Amino acid sequence: AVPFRRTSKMKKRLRRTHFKLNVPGMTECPSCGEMKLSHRVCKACGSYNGKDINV
Template identity: 35%
Template sequence: MGALPKQKYAKARRGKRRQHLETSPPSLDYCPQCHSPKLAYHVCPTCGSYAGREVIEIKSPKKAG
């Protein structure tokens, strides 16, 4: 059997240790090309542009293609 803690680690102490571990939600940005919301530093999923040029081809109707 492995080592076990000698005493209970209270929820308050656990929370104090984890207070710096909170994750932030992914930052949202707006595409300069089509002004639709997209993830920051990502290719726009609506028009496929990044840094002022088209990077990926967008298949507009979702099933066709």
């Protein structure tokens, strides 16, 4: 068993789609004006049970 046909656009697309990449579950943190990582340390104000590191 190995391909017997060239494979049309219809078959190929039905396969490769029905699922798609999505962005991570980042939250918008208005305390630094940029996205943070939900329930994880923020990349611009340190938010995760205290805020003190802006790196």
